[PDB]
Design a binder for this molecule. Structure first.
Ligand SMILES: NC(=O)c1ccc[n+]([C@@H]2O[C@H](COP(=O)([O-])OP(=O)(O)OC[C@H]3O[C@@H](n4cnc5c(N)ncnc54)[C@H](O)[C@@H]3O)[C@@H](O)[C@H]2O)c1
Ligand code: NA
Ligand code: NA
Ligand code: NA
Lengths: 498, 496, 496, 498
């Protein structure tokens, strides 16, 4: 991309207008990846809690208190949430840094984007109730009414908790839906806080609900309950496929965003220093734990050697440390299990014949030994047939492959199971545009890397997802169309004998 | 709601008419007399895979996907004209294979011409949007591209009609497609492919597979090269398909029928309601996704309504679809007729009453066909299987309701949400009811109307997505956000 | 449906509060007692020209026109909040200057907040379109840009309300503007400018001219640097403006009032119709573009309706707008009251009957103000001037109609086409009538509703274009088609 | 960018379903500019004829036969017209060439575009009846119905008669309007023919009407009659202003397209031969009698001398002649009066201090002496303050001015009273895009000149017009919005005493 509060922060779930503990009183300790110290303890909900929230969401939806409220008034409420976000910008960002480990700077930028997401949707709320159709049948009035889709379950990941949450909550509330959200069990702090803020705004009982807990325990209820009309999920491909299959039991709509293997295509006529700078940004922000990370670098052969050296020299200078310290450029990874997964990819890489040009291990420096740190890494001498190139590592790691021609870059970039995002660096804009038109990706950046905003749809082709978040299209996931046809001059058909 | 001597018996793959890779065939039957009328290839899963790979290749070549939207529109329109041109033969073919009346079949052909024409005209009307970017010195745009390779599976009730709903938008947007009609009714689909071949499409753009869903079905829904799986049929096959599609996180569009309510208030135009109740339950022997199998009638007029409906149902004329006096043809197959017969047993076992019908007719000219008497089931309630489940036959149930609020609760008390009607002279009341029914389409004082200009699809278990209308075309498109930074500067986040 | 001691008395040009170039002033009056309440600058045509030139300069500088749509939205929203924040004072100010009741004024402020908020939210929602080009190797796009420099002229009936309708979209799209409220009611407009200054806009983006339309009006409509002239007022001034605008082929948006029919069928809710007939004719002493001055009542109930309406009109409470018991305030000025009085003479001379009212009230507390009695004119027809012309006072005419078809012909028999209502419990009939009325807005069983989410404007002589809604914003945008040939080749048409 | 059809072509007006002569039997001889010979004679209508057509249009609109027909069926009729155009492509093109003088190749292309304009609109007909609004007032239904604007008058010019006619007729018929059209008095042949074709398709009596005659006699009736809802005109600025002032008498909607002073901006990094080629195309197709002609060439100083010499050398080779001869590259101007207007501009140019680098006179070659020919011309050493640069000559003439920087090109290009179209020639696409974004023009071409099609709106900023033709926006000129608000739970306000 780009503490006082814990003593007052709620430790519970929010169900049917009440802050409640888990039905079995279980809890979970939340950790700070910088030092692996327990920073807070929260309720660990049960599947019956999730079910009660879903039933409450349904009841609240049928009561019409929110679903039948005027679109304009719903817009005002979503805007009020937007303002509470900005008002508590400092605390929310610190809280997100404490829980996820990324730098405060990155966190401030997230809060800025979150305010804008809510504000964008607040404004879109009353802008489109459907259409009037010119009917082909005389004496009939035809219209398409857009209604809230209904009860929606929302599941978010640990990399950008509040950000991913806003992308779902904003349109759900703007359209009039009822929702049940469950953040990642290892990072629920800002989500808990946003619910407290939403409660201050005021929503009819049951409209919004927060479940806390392991996906392995409550996850299936949220994706397969018959009272759910839409399941929206952002996370890994395996969990996504599972969710979809479970959702199929009730033919429930699904919206998924599953990360990718994002190419960063650098041509020999690119602005060289810019490309190096953006290659670093693409691979190492949030220790590369970004759905849109540019893990797969494609560089034109004529400048590959020059590029590799320049990138490697820079990677050695990346400053690791605590997210609260101003000099920090890269924080730690999210957990022990994720760090181990990354370490295993290093083994797979070497076993396949690739070269760990730099990094590929844990840093030894004293202030970093207690945290979940992993050195920024560059993997060279690799090709498309390797797992390290085809699979999403989701860590501070990037691979470099060379390409000869424009056509080869395109084939290589498109040679993956994914299709989320990517970039093309070239001073020849005409060439960049031809390439962008041929990349099978939801978002293509020309001479930039990471830009994304509420005004435009985000999502993936192929295995990177189904549907879109953000933009008008993102709002549409939360609506359903109904065709009401009125025959103004009804006559008997008299087909059947009388 | 003859040509056989010249009709192809093969599959159409990568620009060529070919037999199954294993030379297997299948006899096609006419439900009026259960006689074999034609024999066609019974494809293999390797044939389906070859068609998908050809679709992918044709899509990457850009011959169709990069053709101008306007020129694609002209081709879709040419198909529209060939449909109208061969209207007679197509309708006879559809009647011979499905058993519905010829009149119903002509109406289908008229709608099919209009579906293609509609999409032909929409083709060049929307390439995307220009976005006002929140980041200075950037240009933001959303380009709408053909979704890619698409697989299309259709049912046996309205084969060509359901096929047009998928083929038209797929071709209008620039996609490549592989279609597979119901194994028991592929005649008109084979014919439409022959017509499309006359129009002329780049090799691999269009492909036709013939065969059992149980043999080639899984490849069409789970192959990695497919970007969208569009299916119309039953709920069980639909759920299976969706699960299979999830293996590659493939988009799915599904339309699965329903338990459509026909709500009749005491202030409805009485004769109109009886007439439309018949139309809702018995067209195509009730083998319609939109059939009004579930009748909800206000208590004050339930007795008057039941008697009037029952008396009419006894007069329904059954017979051959080619005979002009025929009002209702036979059901589609032995298995489907048996399923219906079993529902009659379930109904009685649950305590419902078979007011009329509920059996096979024994009139000489009907004994050789797959006929089943139009039926009315009374004294039932929402807890019964006969009311909750889609029988998809010439059968309807009747339940009473006291108030406006009860009609709504009862109508919405099912797992489905496809379509329904409200009959009342009080339009204001009809509109309040329509706004509360969880259905994709609601008719006020009518039953069955549907057209290319408006989206058709279901809430809840009746489907995912929509067919027809602009929204139907959108299933065939995919959005791409291209963001250009016009004044690129180094971020300088990482040390140098 | 106090602050004066701190309120500015000057014009706002190019980021500065300034006096008229000739130091001339104008006394503003309170129509309740005709006392001078304030004095403001009376600008010159050179002042207007300087404001237009400053608007152009600011537009070319790009400080506002190239700002992100999102940030522009935030600014428009901040204005919306200042409106709500100063709701009490703005409403009192509007009542003091225009004479309408304080309750009517609070409602205006609530609508004004919503107009701005609406537009604030629409700001970043549509930058244009991507077109699927019919020419291979080309990219086609339509970019929506701010139309440019805009002049805005508002009337005296609802000054701030009419001002918001123009200012909001102009600022949301990135335009520069020069506004001039009615010379007799500029108080809330001056206040809104003070509030906009607090929000902060680049120098020259917003400008306020004060003065007689006869002196500065022509400059605002015929200057070559203006891209759009938006006006709300009377038909004669409107036509003049349009002709003047034609000198530079400048876009015009006009809203000119009307002769709004209020159609009441014999199956309408009788007490509701009487109630709405009163509301339609007498809010703001009928000085509303949307006033229902022309009542069309079905013959069968005409006598019953006339007596019921007349009896009510006699009970209408006139008085000071600040007094809670007031139902109707005074008319706006001497000249306007005189224009109304002259219509009474024309009415009688034509053969119509002044059933009630038609004069100034004598009661002591009303003698010092510009009061005029609510009036009902009967026994008239479509050929009369009193029926064809907009009186714009607390006056209504009553005509009878026999059938649905006659109501439609009579309603449409005028040079206007702004708004109207149909009162009938038979909604189906109300809808048929609404579809045939040549009016920009048609209410079914209501009178006056209007809101930012929907376009407002007139057919025929009631105007050109629309205000409010997406369409209202579009008056402030201009389309540019940018076509890039990605594979340029020489045509070689001309010899080498 | 018809010897024997004349024997069967109608010579009359088409009013209220009948081919009729002028009420006063007056006629007009139509001329072929190649040799100035009379080729045909047609009725010269009266103002009472125009009024009768307008009243018939109104009557037909109120009857609902066309305005209440299904949008789909209206689409089919417009499509039928499209097919008749293609069917009679050969004869129409010959007819257009015979009447206007442009080459037969240019005419075939027009017919191809005309088929596409009708087809485009045929397809758009049933695609948008309005919208459903989410009302801020509870218990109300809000909808916007898009209806045909009503009775429309349409006036076209002599340069591309059928083409300009299609742009108006197509959307008018697709939306359900009634229309009265009047082509240029000196070129009515293809318009008469299209009416004959429309009659074969079949439209309710009065829906379509054709008036023939001088603008000075029937023009005012068509722009100031009270029964007209829209006046659509394409032509010169002076007539346009007159029309608008007349339309104001009834506050009638106006759509105007008035030509321009279109810049053709050529940077030093443009593809040089391409720019020379397109500069020729921009200034000399149809003898430069095109609203979109690139009469004003802006060339970067560094290459001005090279460009001028290269353009001049080419202009001398332009082949003038009969439009029916395949070797013809440029035909004659439209009439004596127009040729004279051009000649006068040459005088003005020299008097102002400009140089007639080449051309600037009538050609003497034997086969051209009998026609209305005028040599392709290049005017150099001029500036923005001159009339020859500020005014639309509308002939085979172009001026050349130099610019130093990107910013100067923009200021110069924008320094006119017009704003219709223009081009930017540069291999640096990024620069071309910056320029395009700043030109106050309705259409900007990057590395091309003239492209225009039904799918995109065409029209001008400033004095080049009001409104748009083509595209969805062009169709919208033919629609009017109506907000129908239904209160579903009406209550008495009780404001007034009881
Ligand atoms: N929505 C509708 O319009 C519709 C249509 C037909 C049947 N139905 C319902 O379904 C029941 C009977 O239908 P049916 O079973 O004959 O048809 P079905 O539901 O299986 O649909 C038929 C289509 O699906 C294909 N198919 C079968 N297995 C497949 C697989 N594993 N993968 C992919 N495709 C596969 C078939 O070859 C055929 O093309 C009825 O009880 C009725 O309620 C609904
Ligand atoms: Na005043
Ligand atoms: Na008008
Ligand atoms: Na001529």
């Amino acid at each position: 991309m780009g503490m006082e509060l814990l003593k007052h922060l709620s430790q519970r779930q929010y169900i049917d207008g009440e802050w409640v503990e888990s039905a079995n009183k279980n809890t979970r300790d939340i950790i700070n990846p910088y030092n692996q110290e327990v920073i807070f303890t929260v309720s660990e909900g049960t599947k019956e809690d999730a079910e009660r929230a879903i039933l409450a969401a349904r009841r609240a939806f049928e009561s019409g208190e929110w679903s039948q409220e005027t679109a304009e008034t719903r817009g005002k409420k979503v805007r009020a949430i937007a303002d509470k976000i900005k008002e508590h910008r400092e605390a929310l960002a610190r809280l997100e840094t404490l829980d996820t480990g990324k730098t405060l700077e990155e966190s401030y930028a997230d809060m800025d984007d979150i305010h804008n997401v809510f504000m964008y949707f607040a404004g879109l709320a009353d802008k489109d109730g459907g259409e009037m159709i010119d009917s082909p049948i005389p004496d009939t009035e035809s219209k398409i009414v857009k209604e809230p889709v209904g009860v929606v379950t929302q599941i978010t990941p640990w990399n950008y908790p509040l950000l991913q949450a806003s992308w779902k909550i904003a349109p759900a509330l703007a359209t009039g839906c009822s929702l049940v959200m469950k953040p990642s069990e290892i990072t629920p702090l800002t989500t808990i806080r946003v619910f407290e803020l939403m409660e201050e705004v005021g929503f009819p009982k049951g409209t919004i609900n927060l479940i806390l807990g392991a996906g392995s325990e409550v996850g299936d209820v949220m994706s397969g309950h018959k009272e759910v009309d839409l399941v929206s999920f952002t996370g890994g491909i395996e969990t996504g496929k599972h969710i979809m299959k479970n959702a199929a039991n009730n033919v429930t709509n699904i919206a998924l965003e599953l990360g990718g293997k994002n190419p960063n295509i650098i041509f020999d006529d690119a602005d060289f220093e810019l490309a190096v700078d953006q290659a670093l940004n693409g691979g190492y922000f949030h220790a590369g734990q970004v759905c849109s990370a540019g893990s797969r670098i494609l560089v034109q052969n004529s400048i590959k050697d020059k590029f590799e050296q320049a990138l490697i020299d820079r990677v050695k200078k990346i400053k690791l440390g605590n997210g609260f310290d101003a000099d920090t450029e890269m924080g730690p990874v999210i957990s022990t299990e994720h760090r181990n997964k990354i370490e295993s990819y290093m083994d797979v890489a070497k076993a396949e014949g690739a070269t760990i040009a730099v990094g590929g291990k844990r840093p030894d420096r004293d202030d970093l030994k207690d945290g979940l740190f992993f050195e920024p890494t560059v993997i060279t001498n690799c090709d498309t047939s390797m797992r390290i190139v085809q699979e999403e590592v989701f860590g501070p790691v990037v691979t470099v492959e060379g390409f000869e021609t424009e056509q080869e870059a395109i084939q290589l970039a498109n040679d993956s199971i994914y299709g989320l995002a990517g970039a093309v660096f070239s001073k020849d804009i005409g060439k960049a545009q031809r390439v962008a038109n041929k990349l099978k990706l939801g978002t293509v950046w020309i001479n930039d890397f990471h830009p994304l905003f509420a005004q435009a749809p985000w999502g993936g082709y192929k295995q990177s997802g189904i549907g879109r978040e953000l933009g008008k299209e993102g709002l549409e996931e939360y609506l359903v169309s109904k065709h009401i046809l009125t025959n103004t001059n009804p006559q008997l058909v008299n087909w059947f004998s009388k």
